Each structure stands twice: as structure tokens, then as C-alpha cells.
Amino acid sequence: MTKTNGQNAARKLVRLRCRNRWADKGWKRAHTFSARKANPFGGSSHAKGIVLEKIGVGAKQPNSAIRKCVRVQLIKNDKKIIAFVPNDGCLHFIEENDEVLVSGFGRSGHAVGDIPGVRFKIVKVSNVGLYALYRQKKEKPR
Amino acid sequence: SLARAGKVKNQTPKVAKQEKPKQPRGRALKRLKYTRRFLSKTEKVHMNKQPPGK
Amino acid sequence: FQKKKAEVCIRTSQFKVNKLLNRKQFIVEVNHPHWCGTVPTQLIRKKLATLYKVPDASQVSLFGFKTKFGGGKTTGFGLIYDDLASLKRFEPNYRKTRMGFGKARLPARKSVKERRNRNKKLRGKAK
């Protein structure tokens, strides 16, 4: 009542499944170059950039806070993004024109938490891990 | 207003680490836990029950 | 514990006579129950010569000894040549260098290659 069943009907079944797979959002995103062209990392897991300025982003309701973020320009393709500086007081380790390493935020391009439109995170500055500076296991060079 | 970054971290009174003798490592540590939970001292079981207070 | 002296016992296996190279080849196994360390290979040479009644201990060659884990044993390989002349003819140069009589080392291969490439630019008496 819903499927063809004939013994010699393999061509119908093959074309049926091929057509309906484009309706799966996950499958389509994997077999189309539109997502990669709009992805600033270009398919990589990390990227390097230069800090342009420090900015503050307000949290979404019902939370209330100022989230410390940074605007960086990527070296490989000269694109501008906004990245989050995670831990407490870690904004003081970052200065303008510093070189930073950026990673994703864990949801494959989706925004995370109460931070509006932020999907990137700072993990390393001036060739030393940011979390290591927070724990004072290393000192900022220069 | 980015001037308040690190407010609580720098405001916390500093408490030093307390020196204590070391714990056994490896197979000895597993032996220690086995005797604490079973064997010694034979309902709900509490692993980190705390003293009362308010 | 009973303090004793040091004594070794030797056995052979997979014996074969090789007339094409004027020698006999076999596997040598030595048991040293109370030895302090590893038995030097020259000592095994003397015992093997005595056991197989060879006129000169210099015509037996031994190499490649592995000590069994746990101690008390060692296994290797041995060759008994028919005479001293045959040994000096059929033996690899590195093995006879261990026994005393061998050619010296030729100069470093890098130096030879440099001279060879320089001479490729010339012709006649210059080369």
C-alpha cells in the first residue's frame, strides 16, 4: 500500500531512495559545498588570527552579564569573526595585534549558551596555552 | 564596560595548601579502597557524609 | 646455598658436515649454572676444541650468542674448519677481525665519493 514490491523493480527503488536523501538536512550538508564556502575555518578544526579589538557582548534573557569577547581576523583568508575568552580575568592576557589560535565552541557552527551569535573560542595566545596562563603554569613571553 | 574583568578572582582571600603525607599508588591504592568500602565496617550508603551545620 | 667453583658444560645439535666449504657447522649450547656474568667466547673455543679433538683452537669460529632469560644458559653457532688456511679463505672479514687476523679499515666512504666525483671532470693523466 506504500511500497513497490515487484521482483524486477530495483530501478524504481534505487531512484526513490536517491531522491529522498536530499531531504535529510545532515546528509545534504555533507554532500554540498555551500556550508564549507560560508564556514570561516574552511573545514579545519582550528585557525590563527590577529586580534583587532576587545568588545563586550551582553547575555540573553533571563541571564544578565557582560561576556568578554574579542574580534579577530583570520590569516588564511582575511575573514572577521568574534571569539569568546573563557575563564575568569583572562582578558588581561590579550592585547591588540596579538596572534591567537581559535577553535570551535562544540556545536559544529551553532551558537552556544546565552552568548548571542558566538561560535568560536580562544585557546592559545602568543604560542602559549590560554588555560596554562590562567593556572600560572607558564608566563606570557616578551 | 570591560574594567571589571577578574573582579572575584582578585578579591578572594588567599589560603595556602596544607601539607599531608602521600597516599599509596597503583595496586596498593585499590587495596586501600577495597577494605574501606567492604571488609572493614561490614540501607543507604554515604561516601562523603558531612557534619551538620547551617 | 653451597659455594662452589665455576664450571661449564657444552652440547651441540643439528650437526652437519659441509664438504663444499671444508667445515662442519652446528648449534652450540652451553650451561653455566653458577657463572658470574657471561662466559667469554674464547673460553668456549678452548672447550669445543678439546671436545671435538681439533689440533688447533684457532680453526673454530663462533658467533651470535643469546643468553636465555632467567640465566644459566646461552646458545650460539659454531664452525669447525679443516685447517687454518681454509678458515682464512672462507671467512668474512669482520669475523676474522675479531679473531685477530684481518685487513684494516679502508678510508671513510665519504672521502672516496668526493674524489670520484672530482675525477669525473677530467681526462687523461689528471685522473
Place this chain on the structure above:
Amino acid sequence: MRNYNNFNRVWKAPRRPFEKERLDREMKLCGQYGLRCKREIWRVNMTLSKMRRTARLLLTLPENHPRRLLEGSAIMRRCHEYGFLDEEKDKLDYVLSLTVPDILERRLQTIVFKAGLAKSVHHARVLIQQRHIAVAKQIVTIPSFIVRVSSERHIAFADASPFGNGRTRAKAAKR
């Protein structure tokens, strides 16, 4: 490049990390047999699953199938030779009933303790690692050595240990 030496894996982690019942059952075994880490238990799990998977395949085939005859006798022979099953058990259906403690009993660490050469299962572990135990005149320092039934009666102190004719704290005390 151009190296053809093979290697593989022997253990797998459980797929529910924090299960209260499983955690307690495993802490029982670590204390009872004196193991070092959970990885030693999970190693035994993989061997049992390989045996049980093979048995299920053979029991599907008809009895007179040639592969069932050759493989069935081979796996039963291995179980008897290592003491996993007693010789009364002859049919291939009894291998499906093997459990984790059945294999842990045959470790060298627990064999020497039950043989009387050690005061405790933790005393047995250090003795093996310190080159005091020999199996058929061969020093063994691997606690996970699985002893065969025909080799049980050959376990004794090594001949180079102080405990049996060795000594070729006392050595440093007298100087």
C-alpha cells in the same frame, strides 16, 4: 615504510561509564584478586566474548558438519588444557557458561597464593615480580601468566632466589 609486523588490541571499554551495579561488582574483583587497574578485568572480558562468539557459530551448524568437528574439538581441548572446564564437561554447550572468575582463577598470581607459597594475594604479586617463582625450572615474572593443569605441580621457588639455593639486605648488611 615497508615493515610488515602485525599488531592488534586486546581490550575494550564498557559503553556505560557510570553504572552503579557494574562499578561495585568490579571493585569486588580488584580487591579479591589484587589487580592493578580496571584494564586487567576488561582484558578478560574480550577473551570470553571471543570464545562465546565462536561457540554460537558452531552450534548453529549441523553436527556432522566438518568444520564443527574440527573446531569443536579444538576449542574444548584448549579449555580442558587450561582448567577453564573440568573433564566431565564434554559437550560444546558448556563453553557458553564460562564466567570472568573462571579465568581469573588460573592466573599465576592467584595460583601461588592458593598453593601456599604466599601469605596473601598481594604477597604473591611482589614475589612474582621479584624473580622468586619458577614454573618447571623457568623463572616467570608475569603475573598474568595462565598456568596449565599439567604444569600446576611444577611450581616452586626458583633456584637462584634466597628462598631456593641462591645468594651467590643481608648482602649489604655485612659490609
Place this chain on the structure above:
Amino acid sequence: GVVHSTKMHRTIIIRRNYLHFIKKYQRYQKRHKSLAVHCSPAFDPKQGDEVVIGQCRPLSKTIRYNVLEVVSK
């Protein structure tokens, strides 16, 4: 095969029909292939007849077979 066309001079097109099996769906497809065959004047095949052909050396850009026997209708 079966004769498909007889419009060239001393050359015919034959067609072979067969069923191809798709493992995933456990079912079959219909497919066909075409070949160009040299036809000797000793035969007079018509569209729809069945022929037996044999392999030979290359005779043109596309011809690799010769007609050996004709079974009428």
C-alpha cells in the same frame, strides 16, 4: 542476440538483453547492450531474428564480430 537494425551495407546492429541484480534491494533491473556485426551475403537476416556471432580481429572502428548462424523468426 536479436537483430535490431539492417540499414548499413553488409553490417547489422544486434542487441543483447539481460537482468542485473542489485544486492541491497534483492531485486533485478533490465539492461541491454548493442554491438555492430559484419553480415556475410550468405545470410539474409531481418529485424527480430536471432543470430549466433563469433569474435574476430578488428574489422572497423566498431566491428569485432561476424555472423555465423541465423535462426529465422
Place this chain on the structure above:
RNA sequence: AUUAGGGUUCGAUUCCGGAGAGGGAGCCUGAGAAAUAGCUACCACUUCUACGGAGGGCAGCAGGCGCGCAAAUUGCCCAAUGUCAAAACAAAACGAUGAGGCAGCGAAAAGAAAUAGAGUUUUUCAAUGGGGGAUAUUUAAACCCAUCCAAUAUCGAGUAACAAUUGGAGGACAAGUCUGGUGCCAGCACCCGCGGUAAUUCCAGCUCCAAAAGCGUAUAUUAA
């Protein structure tokens, strides 16, 4: 790779087949080449020069520079495995070989395994490696492994400072209604949600939990 079964996905990379030597054509020799550590020309780059002229091709092995999130030594040797060839090895008398092999660097990944043990009323016993060495062994020569600390004759654990880490403790999900600080701030939080003066969630101290010489994070992909 993943796994009830059916499937989904990866395969530049050791073996087999194809193609190329900056780009693009053309060709001589030769049994065999449209050859590039062969030749000829053009294009793009580029080196020496007494200015007349003459040279170059690392997607071979080491090395540089750039590029990037991203990948080792300008090492030793033909001892083994092979190739070439006028050639067995030796004797005045040692063929070449960055193919290949051996070491250095190397927490990609895989296997084994220390950081104590036994007692007596908080002190007593043994045992052993990490390490230092050796008549020596291994090796082309070294190195690692293995053997030993007298065979007449050979160093060494008590805070055994020879001192284990990485993440967590409302729920999913194993584990504190502890004690200070902060007061919708600073911050946490993959999701639900905490924080506005008594915070089970932030910053710390104690205690506890999980895996353990390993453990977090990001991005892909398989199961779910």
C-alpha cells in the same frame, strides 16, 4: 573503521596496475624511451662573467625558504636482502649502490608492566627494581635487550624527597544538604539551568568520586 542481521563510510600512503618529472611540443641512440641526474626550441623563473660569452631543473636522500592547525638527522654502513657486470673467495690484490639496512628525533597507534610486602606493641624484619658498574655478551662498529654484583676475589631505598596526574561532586551521571569570599557583578553552564546577602552549580580550603602513565578540548566519521 563500525557491527545481531541487512548496511554506512574511508582508501594520497608499503603489494599489483596507470601516469609525470616547472609548463608545452619535437627527437636521436637503442631489442626496448616520445627517456628528462639524454638532446632541441619556445614560455615563466633563475646563476657566473674580464660584457665577448657560458649555465640550471630535489614530486631521489639529507637539508633550507615559504605555506599553513599540521609532519624528524645537511648521521653510520654495504654486515644482511637484492640489482648491474668483463665479476666466486683468497693471494702485492677489499667493484658500485641515500635501493636497502642500522642508530638519532618521535605520548600517531599497539603489547607487558613499578610507585611495596610480612609481622609485633609503632617499630622490627626480610625482598627487589629505577640507578652505578663488569672477566664480558650483542653489533659491520656502536646502541638497546638479555646475564652478574664472586667463580679465591665485585655497589647500592625509610619521609623507601626514588614524593602521580587529569577532570569532576544539583540532574542526565559515580561522588558534600561542610567552611570562607562574591552579591544578576565576576563567572559557570555541550542541554535543562545557577548567580539579585543563608549559592548543593561561580572564586578557594578540606573531604570524596572516575580513569590512570595517562587524562581533557576542537573538527570530521561509524553506532546510538
